[PDB]
Amino acid sequence: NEEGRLIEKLLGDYDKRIKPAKTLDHVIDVTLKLTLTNLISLNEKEEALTTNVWIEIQWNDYRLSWNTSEYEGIDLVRIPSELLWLPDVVLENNVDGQFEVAYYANVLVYNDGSMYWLPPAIYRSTCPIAVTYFPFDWQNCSLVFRSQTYNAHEVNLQLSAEEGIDPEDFTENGEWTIRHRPAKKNYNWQLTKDDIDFQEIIFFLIIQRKPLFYIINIIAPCVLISSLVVLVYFLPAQAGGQKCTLSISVLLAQTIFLFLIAQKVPETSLNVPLIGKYLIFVMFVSLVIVTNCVIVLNVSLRTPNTHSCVEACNFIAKSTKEQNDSGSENENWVLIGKVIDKACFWIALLLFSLGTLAIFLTGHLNQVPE
Amino acid sequence: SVMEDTLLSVLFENYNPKVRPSQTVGDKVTVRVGLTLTSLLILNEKNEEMTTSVFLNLAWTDYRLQWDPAAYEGIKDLSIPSDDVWQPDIVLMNNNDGSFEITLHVNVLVQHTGAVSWHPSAIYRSSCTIKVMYFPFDWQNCTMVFKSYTYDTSEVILQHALDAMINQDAFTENGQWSIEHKPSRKNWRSDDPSYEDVTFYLIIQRKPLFYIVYTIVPCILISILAILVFYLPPDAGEKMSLSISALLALTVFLLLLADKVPETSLSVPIIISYLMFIMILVAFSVILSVVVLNLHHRSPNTHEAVEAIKYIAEQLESASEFDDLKKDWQYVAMVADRLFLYIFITMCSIGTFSIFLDASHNVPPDNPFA
């Protein structure tokens, strides 16, 4: 059925780099869509990500509707990349890495001139996550992508649901979670003052994270730590005299442990994102732990020292007794522990407060954004 | 002139680029393979990874390129880019852990009656079994098998030069190791129809003596404080507490050592030998110091009328000094002496043992340099 002649006919006139534009004043009808399938790297501190995107590419060019020998033969054709108009895709705000396997792949030419193509792409991008995205309220990841080649007066992109999802194939091994994916089809006019709009593709992704594992590594140590210091605090009333320094050994040990923590998780936030709110409670609930802690030694620091021939000589010896007694008396008026005992209950309720202030508020920063 | 344009022409007229210098299925083209090593740059003795560099000298004959007056008799030797001969897309059965650099697509030396000389130096990512057995003094040997990765020995035969050539022929002077010999044996495993790979043996010897030196000092210097903590008891019995300080200190030190050892073998591990027994030597000082600590613990305490007053005085003092004299009877120093010399036996015995093993390890397992 002219099968040979037809193929040979169009290829004669067949034009490569020219768009299937009826004329030049109403552009062509280009369809696109993306199904996430892999969110490979979340480096939120630098606001960048890598995803395998199903670049659903679609458009029209009847420049090749065929006859009985090709259209009718099979309403389906798979013809090579380099052989029809191809959208060189990229995410305005995100794509920071040229697409990988997102091009040069078999496209699809039905019989009426319908064109369908969908290569998978692993590429880098840069979405929000700017001093926020670590809360409980989430920063919507907004990625708009379009051909970076021509502008909407010849090219026109389409899309679909802007309501329905990113969690469609959001990775289960992510240290986060997604709750909604909105997407709008739009024109080109940005803050930078560019005109002649080339339409693009907006990708909202408001997602959650924070599934803490470090939480109780932080929560039990601090309680053990708080108790340790409250040991420092109540243990003195229980502890012997050789305990003032006992308490000290703990301060040394207590903060050896402390800044070691200060070195451990600070590292944490640098390799991953960052945010100050949760940060504030820790270091300052931590600085208060330290504060009343050294306060304690300054407390176990405070007090002045706790930090006939027969009878003439019987007279004076009965004195060393009363004399030294006056001295041991010293000890008395000095170490009558009103401040210490009370210091236990001091930190105790202060403990309860620092704790309540913090976990109660952690209750809130999980409960407002809940 | 003598049919120059003619020859010249006909040759390029009839010559086939993509063809093999042989006629049908037979003895094939006997290609010569022989590499003069440059030097080696990195031995990942831990994963058995080998990045070296050498010359890929190949050479066989193209009786299809024998010239005539001007290019044959005119200039018996002329240079011409490869790209026109079957090239051993050589991979290494164990090694060839990565691509060729300066290996293919380079010019070659073509002789008059067809001889072909191609001498390219290259860096190649290989992997030989230096296994986790690249540290015993008896060390081990490896199998380096080179050969093509699409061709099967049917249309060419491979042949070698020396087998003793050695690998220290271009051994890296930068190597923390040393070498005894390089065997070269031609192979054709019958598990595949394709005659293939050649096994090259590395009877490697890697003796980098640098930190085990100050590692000895711990063992012995730690022993200093050790013998010291075992010596400090009848030296300064009051060592009682200070003693425990010593082991905290002694244990943290050895645990940090525990810290550097795993991360250091992390790139160059082999048999445990050294670690195997220093691990025991470890456990030894560890437990010896802890049971001496229990040696330390075992002590439940240590860890007329005128004259009547007198009499009451006579009894007061004497009565309790026996009581504290009892404490003497209880914490005498029999054990300390006996086990400080059991300390003598233990530490000098287990000491002269790994001393010995280590002794035996460097001299005894040294001659298998083959």
Place this chain on the structure above:
Amino acid sequence: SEHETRLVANLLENYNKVIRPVEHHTHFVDITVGLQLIQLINVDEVNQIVETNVRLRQQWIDVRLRWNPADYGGIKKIRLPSDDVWLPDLVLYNNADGDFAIVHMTKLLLDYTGKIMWTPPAIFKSYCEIIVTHFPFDQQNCTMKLGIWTYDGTKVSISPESDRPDLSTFMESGEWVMKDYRGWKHWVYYTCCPDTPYLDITYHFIMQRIPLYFVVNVIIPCLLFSFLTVLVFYLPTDSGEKMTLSISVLLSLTVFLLVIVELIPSTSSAVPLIGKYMLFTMIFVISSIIVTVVVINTHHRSPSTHSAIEGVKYIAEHMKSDEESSNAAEEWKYVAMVIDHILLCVFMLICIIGTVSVFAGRLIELSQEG
């Protein structure tokens, strides 16, 4: 000779490489897959990435390659290079992290009839489940799907070839160990479209992890610490003289436990172990915590411990006696009767917790070992 040049040239001319051996509208191009992992180079359970050896056995028929005495008569079966062939865009579904390595420009074999095989020596980059359920003793089955990438069951179909183990060439250098692996076929039609979609090979990797070295180092400082805390119990009841002395240890040891935490979570971060593994350490380590704090607060729990001439003698003797009293008071503080209670109180606790820790340890080791 035998139509020599006419043979060869004709073949080149009317033959389009890119054409797919479509035969009427039916069976699709029947093409089968058959993967034989020769061996594996490296894996990262954490990042679920593997670099493996694969020889892909690809089969299909091109009735256009059948011959007569001038192609098959020449030499039965022969070697024709790929290029001219339509290469299925093979792709590991939820995997595919990397390009097939050494798939390109290789050769294939054509029979006197036509049948062709394409089996190029591959090694590539993979991506399979490991989830936080792979390092378990109870493993997880790495779900790996393979099949035709951009063509449908109407244009083409990828089918399986045979059963074979994954431990058939499983890496003996792996930090994991195999249970079994099976692979069965399937055809995926989607409720989406009423059409008949691609075919697929689904791999299932059932292997359990954890190399045993780890095992020994960690549980022994625990029985280690067990003895110091064991001493933490026996040291006090048999000698309360070095309570503070132990203050030291409590510092040196939880910090030892703290620093072991850096090491094994990075292990945790180095290798994905099912979190329920973590709780072992959780309560275990943390009881070292709750027990201490009580044991040592209790350790600490005690008020201060942690004629006329004749009358002279009685006012003086009376002085010695009520201080006599006093001495007994503070000792009436640190009794040795219940420190024995806490000794068996908790040692049974430890033999309970311990044997309870051994419980689930032993239990699913009653499942894993099977």
Place this chain on the structure above:
Amino acid sequence: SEHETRLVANLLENYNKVIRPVEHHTHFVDITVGLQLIQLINVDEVNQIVETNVRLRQQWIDVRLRWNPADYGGIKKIRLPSDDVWLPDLVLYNNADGDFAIVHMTKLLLDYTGKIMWTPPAIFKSYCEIIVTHFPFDQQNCTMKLGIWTYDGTKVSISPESDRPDLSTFMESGEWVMKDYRGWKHWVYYTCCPDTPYLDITYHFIMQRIPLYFVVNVIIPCLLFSFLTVLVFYLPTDSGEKMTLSISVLLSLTVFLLVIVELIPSTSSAVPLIGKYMLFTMIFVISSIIVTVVVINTHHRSPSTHSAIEGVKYIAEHMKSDEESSNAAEEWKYVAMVIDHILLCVFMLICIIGTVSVFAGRLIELSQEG
């Protein structure tokens, strides 16, 4: 129609792209270049690396592109594929650490006249000074020169176009802040050669750096460590009975900050700064050492505080009188008076060298702030 084939065919034949629109022996090719920087995704102060994006606004003319009613007449301004253009090998003189990305395969602006522009959304890695004087409060101006690579003035010439700031689109998520950005042009002829060399655009980035994170934690342990030092001094007055205790905290203190300086070297060499800074910490802290040197050395500075029946009554009270004047001796040394001068002596001196630290620190920022 309108000379349809005659117009595009003629254009391809007598048109060349290798060539540059050279116009007689004069001003070179009028190249108009400029920076349009809208994003700075990644940069490292330490390695002075910058991967940003700047659309390379080029502007120059080629008369050969002029047309009549058959190209201009067709549609005023037409955009031609860049291929037809002679693209300059532009490059960052002391920068250029990376290929410009996204410039290839793009659109070119042609006019009826000939005017042409092509602003490519080029993203690339750069390399300019930041040195140790990059992040102070007083900034440094990174010198960034750009201009033709391998072409001399005798063939191509570029020139600035407009002034535009660096903060016009500077990173609000930067760990730095900008003050000013200037760009002027020039042509560099060298004393070497009598010739007229390339032209270039020199950018200068003036911006101050350093977040305040590192700042908060340098000074907290300082004041906190000055609290323990303050304790260091006050304790001998309120609790000299814990001078040894003081010793413990100096092993504490010392190790802590010796460890603080560990952080510094990592962080500092991990994030660049002018050494002149650490000099502050150097002596100030060696000051706590120099002072504890003297102060606790001084703290420990003191020798040891760091009838006949009537007869024995006299041998006895004698026994007591001898020792009593003796105990007076050890107190004779711990006069509790110089302890107050040492804390005040140094309290002022630390309040002064602290105020000294405070001084240049604030002076330098009364310089920066500016």
Place this chain on the structure above:
Amino acid sequence: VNEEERLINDLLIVNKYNKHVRPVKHNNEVVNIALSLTLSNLISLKETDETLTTNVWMDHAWYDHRLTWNASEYSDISILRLRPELIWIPDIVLQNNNDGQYNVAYFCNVLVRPNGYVTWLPPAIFRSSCPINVLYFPFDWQNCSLKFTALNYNANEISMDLIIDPEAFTENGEWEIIHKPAKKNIYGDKFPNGTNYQDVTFYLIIRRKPLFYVINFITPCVLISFLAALAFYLPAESGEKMSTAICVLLAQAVFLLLTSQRLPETALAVPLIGKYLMFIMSLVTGVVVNCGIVLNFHFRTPSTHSGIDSTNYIVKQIKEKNAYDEEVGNWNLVGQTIDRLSMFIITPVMVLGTIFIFVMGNFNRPPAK
């Protein structure tokens, strides 16, 4: 038009000119090729493994006899451009430093003179394995040797004849460039029966070492040493701080150990000599030893570490008696030994401390020699 169409058709570079054929006027001595080496920058140094990443301007020259043009080529413009594939380009190989293929010093735009002479010189980001050896650390810091030339051609197909290294030495290097000589040559060898390929031999003699590690590293030594130094002064002022003195050993000990730990770390990253590494660890051991000495010397001594008349005589008995105990201890004290101890601590610190900077000098003098 001056025969231009026709003439470049005459040259047709690729078609008429033999680019796969090197115009060496046929088999003879060689095409006079010359290489020029100018380092544009040195970005990374690895002393330990003798590897260097450096940039070079690959200035190359050779006369292309088929390149000579006429009026509408030559004189039309006595200078014009022509890509690599249309210009013969020498196959310059970095003889002992190209174990890392050359980048963007490859097939780049070249300069076409009028009478065949051509000029190709682009940028080379390269990696090298220069003569570091474990002798690239003594003060001379060896001499890094490198040879450049056209790899493929021999002495009858190529002749390459022959700039300071610090001309573009990187200022962010941890070393110092003292000199850089340049002299070409040609050379055959034993297995080769003919001479060939001429080359650019460029030796770089440098030096390196911080004046910074010295700062924060010896700093703690005189500070730490004064602790051990005071250690022996402190046994006098108050040796009673037994346990606390003991604490400091743990503490000065843990300090000592990981200080040495940081040492190899930077060490592996740097091939350090055996001469210097010992003075460091030898002397900290000097204190380590004396810390152990501290131990014993600090806790080394065995102990220092008529009826009414009848009754009181009992006491005068108990009196004197334990006065013997009391004194059995000062017998041990050993105090007239005090100064000598700290005097014979001073003397040795002086001996060894001097011995080092004494040795510092005895090797500081001969290099300056």
